[PDB]
């Protein structure tokens with residue numbers, strides 16, 4: 001038995017969705033209302049009270065990148081996610097960590113803030129895009145020739161690019177064509193296609209929030 | 215060849231020192247002046263420009279918990295650090311992540327700030343202590359019956375406890391005896407004994423800065 005507590009537009013939740021589908025395991029997806037969190041969510045992640053929460057045979061695993069590695073280590077022979085080489089594996093972990101650290105606050109402020117905080121966030125996220133663009137280089141994936149951990153770690157953000165462009169006056173699509181091509185590559189995988197919500201859906205939800213709350 | 219670029223009182227660098235010694239590998243330690251970073255440091259960690267940086271056969275590995283896992287995966291049979299069970303491994307990673315996330319800002323502010331910011335930091339770090347104390351519970355180690363990843367992730371902070379008590383007016387030693395006993399346990403390992411600097415030395419270094 002596998003349960004995933006998640007939020008549809010969560011790029012972190014999307015990672016675990018993708019990892020589960022890469023392994024072709026069946027699981028129960030449960031949508032959480034983050035303004036009205038379930039007893040199960042609070043019981044299973046008392047420390048952070050965040051989604052995604054992966055519940056396997058009744059036991060909780062928290063933090064999306066830790067969940068992906070957990071899923072990979074349980075089913076290593078089906079669509080291996082992490083490299084087998086320790087050095088390459090260390091590098092994949094580094095770049096997933098980089099994404100987590102650099103996007104957590106700015107990407108929240110991109111859609112939830114205006115004024116000075118949003119401005120700061122724009123600068124930081126553009127810096128992330130430039131850095132990831134440089135790291136990707138001319139490879140098909142962050143993982144080189146094949147879809148890997150860092151691809152999983154960032155692809156969910158693609159579903160937000162249009163939102164960031166519209167609500168934060170960013171230019172992403174025309175400025176980072178290698179990243180757009182990479183995203184198009186990843187989207188051909190059924191795991192990714194299933195996990196990522198429609199970009200217009202995200203945009204509509206975020207603009208609604210900004211109208212009503214701001 | 216293994217080079218470690220580090221700063222002696224860095225609790226993060228201490229993790230990698232410990233992991234290397236757990237595996238009994240020889241390596242070159244290089245002390246970095248963090249106010250005057252070496253060209254090697256800037257070349258090898260251009261993204262964060264932080265220590266510890268582990269350089270193996272000329273190739274850099276950054277972030278201490280990632281370095282520890284790298285070292286564990288290179289030499290898995292000598293004093294294994296991470297659990298072999300995937301779920302237990304996930305939990306070890308979770309608690310090392312918890313420590314990284316909750317200590318990064320407060321522990322810097324404990325000695326570098328005053329007023330409202332230091333007060334906030336004290337509140338946050340005591341919460342970390344209480345949470346880890348609860349997680350440790352009655353086990354000998356965070357890793358259970360044996361020294362493991364989370365023990366490595368936190369043990370370096372012990373060498374700063376006296377500093378926090380003195381410069382932030384915190385009470386740690388008298389308030390968290392299970393954590394004190396745990397640290398005594400860890401200190402019996404040669405890796406930990408080598409890595410952790412004297413508590414008064416750390417305090418002196420911070421007092422100069424303040």
Ligand SMILES: N[C@@H](CCC(=O)N[C@@H](CS)C(=O)NCC(=O)O)C(=O)O
Nearest residue numbers: 010012034049050051052063064065
């Ligand atoms: N580091 C976490 C971040 C997860 C996260 O931020 N989840 C958000 C949804 S996108 C959340 O649950 N927020 C709930 C809250 O903070 O109240 C991970 O990688 O899983």
Ligand SMILES: N[C@@H](CCC(=O)N[C@@H](CS)C(=O)NCC(=O)O)C(=O)O
Nearest residue numbers: 224225226248264265266277278279
């Ligand atoms: N997340 C990093 C943190 C390492 C870190 O913060 N290192 C400090 C020394 S304790 C540093 O290099 N500071 C550089 C500076 O102050 O510019 C890790 O775990 O290795």
Ligand SMILES: [Mg+2]
Nearest residue numbers: 295296360362
């Ligand atoms: Mg062990």
